[PDB]
Design an enzyme around this catalytic site. Structure first.
Site, PDB file in Angstrom:
ATOM      1  N   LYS A 177       0.791  -1.213   0.000  1.00  0.00           N
ATOM      2  CA  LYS A 177       0.000   0.000   0.000  1.00  0.00           C
ATOM      3  C   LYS A 177       0.818   1.255   0.000  1.00  0.00           C
ATOM      4  CE  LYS A 177      -1.827   1.571   3.738  1.00  0.00           C
ATOM      5  NZ  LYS A 177      -2.954   1.605   4.725  1.00  0.00           N
ATOM      6  N   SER A 213      -9.758   4.892 -13.864  1.00  0.00           N
ATOM      7  CA  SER A 213      -8.693   4.148 -13.185  1.00  0.00           C
ATOM      8  C   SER A 213      -7.969   5.118 -12.261  1.00  0.00           C
ATOM      9  CB  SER A 213      -7.756   3.562 -14.231  1.00  0.00           C
ATOM     10  OG  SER A 213      -7.229   4.593 -15.035  1.00  0.00           O
ATOM     11  N   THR A 248     -10.930   0.100  -7.899  1.00  0.00           N
ATOM     12  CA  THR A 248     -10.677   0.389  -9.296  1.00  0.00           C
ATOM     13  C   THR A 248      -9.455  -0.410  -9.694  1.00  0.00           C
ATOM     14  OG1 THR A 248     -10.336   2.222 -10.916  1.00  0.00           O
ATOM     15  CG2 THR A 248      -9.407   2.567  -8.799  1.00  0.00           C
ATOM     16  N   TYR A 249      -8.717   0.034 -10.693  1.00  0.00           N
ATOM     17  CA  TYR A 249      -7.438  -0.602 -11.001  1.00  0.00           C
ATOM     18  C   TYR A 249      -6.374   0.459 -11.248  1.00  0.00           C
ATOM     19  CZ  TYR A 249      -8.835   0.336 -15.871  1.00  0.00           C
ATOM     20  OH  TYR A 249      -9.306   0.953 -17.032  1.00  0.00           O
ATOM     21  N   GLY A 258     -11.747   9.526 -14.535  1.00  0.00           N
ATOM     22  CA  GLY A 258     -12.996   9.017 -15.047  1.00  0.00           C
ATOM     23  C   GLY A 258     -14.108   9.115 -14.027  1.00  0.00           C
ATOM     24  N   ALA A 259     -14.890   8.044 -13.930  1.00  0.00           N
ATOM     25  CA  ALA A 259     -15.968   7.913 -12.945  1.00  0.00           C
ATOM     26  C   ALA A 259     -15.449   7.977 -11.504  1.00  0.00           C
ATOM     27  CB  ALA A 259     -16.727   6.591 -13.146  1.00  0.00           C
ATOM     28  N   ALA A 260     -14.194   7.579 -11.301  1.00  0.00           N
ATOM     29  CA  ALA A 260     -13.570   7.632  -9.990  1.00  0.00           C
ATOM     30  C   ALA A 260     -13.365   9.073  -9.495  1.00  0.00           C
ATOM     31  CB  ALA A 260     -12.236   6.886 -10.003  1.00  0.00           C
TER      32      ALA A 260
END
Lengths: 127, 116, 127, 116
Positions: free
Chosen positions: D9, D25, D57-58, D73-75
């Site tokens: 992390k 992403s 997400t990735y 994006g949507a994130a």
């Protein structure tokens, strides 16, 4: 048997245990008395699911060991926004294993009462 | 390459109990578990169609023939008696096998009567 | 190598595609033109993650095949409460594989424009 | 028996971009990916400490040395520029190995400067 179908099974859980510390300034994780980790078969750095029975919030984090005998359940960092001291939580880990093993699997479970006093079964626990 | 596939599900069934006192799991008539291939202690996803809530828990058996769906403990705050829920489990397997995999599905009518 | 560390990787995805049908009375699943499934390497009965870009809702379901050439994206049953016709969604599947394979893995991706017209890359897509 | 373990992390890092136009992403300085062992196209969990939102997400790579964390994006509706996020990935392995597993961790100070 290669290509066997793999199940996701409850490995073990701490049944309703009380949160003792919640500190936004320590690392995001849940620190748990090592005795409790032993009883539930949960490992340091293992992904865990936490359901906060008091407020209904459910979240995922990973376990870290607190001192044996401390009786600590510390929900820290970002997770301190999902639980407070005194909240009752359920902490579970899940493992994968082939179907035949899953069919006889018995999860490792610990129950709690009072001052995070750990019991093997629910028999002595108040309602 | 390992795929995550629908193992099985109970289509729209009705919640018959939501007991806050009991452990946080979903208890399911063993006949329904048998039909859907869902095991005691297996992770399950529950979609409550009546109130929109989605959550994960694990399955335990209820008495065979009882037609019980019991969403218990902390889960009882995600569904009340009479709510319509969908209950599913997922397994993994290599891609080659996943390509021909068939899930185990049970459908219901009336009072949690399995279409047989 | 036995006991090798297993990664969760993006297998493939339908980039922003438009929802064409949303029917509370069909089974809870997302039905997708088989051509689109082929391009993203997504299988019937495979678990999929859907992110609704229009309303911000994210949910998981499984894929079923719609007729080749139908250009259908149908979000059905319980999922019809998370997307409506005209909403823009992203549909992804994830697979697991050992680390060395993950390090060279290339996901299967499809882009969309207009009347769910499928492209291999974003080059021709309006902004 | 297969365990799900923290692979690695990034502790508290700051979101430097949130570009709605880009693909959905999270783009991360390749140096940070290298330190945390996170791969391009790997599933990641993001915890936004500033606004409480958690999502998956990735990862994709951003330019090495750029110190970029871009939630795109949507994130980008889950984090704004300046938000503090935690980014993690999880791997599986047998229990025997999991017992001695050590995650790959990176800590940050100031302007996404990795503690080195």
């Amino acid at each position: 048997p290669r290509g066997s179908m793999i199940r996701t099974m409850l490995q073990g859980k701490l049944h309703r245990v009380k949160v003792t510390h919640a500190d936004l300034h320590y690392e995001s994780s849940c620190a748990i008395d090592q005795d409790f980790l032993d009883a539930a078969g949960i490992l340091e750095n293992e992904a865990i699911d936490i359901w906060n029975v008091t407020n209904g919030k459910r979240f995922s984090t990973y376990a870290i060991a607190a001192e044996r005998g401390s009786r600590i359940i510390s929900v820290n960092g970002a997770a301190a926004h999902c639980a407070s001291v005194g909240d009752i939580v359920i902490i579970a880990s899940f493992v994968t294993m082939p179907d035949e093993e899953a069919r006889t699997w018995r999860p490792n479970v610990a129950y709690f009462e009072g001052d995070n006093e750990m019991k093997r079964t629910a028999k002595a626990i108040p309602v």
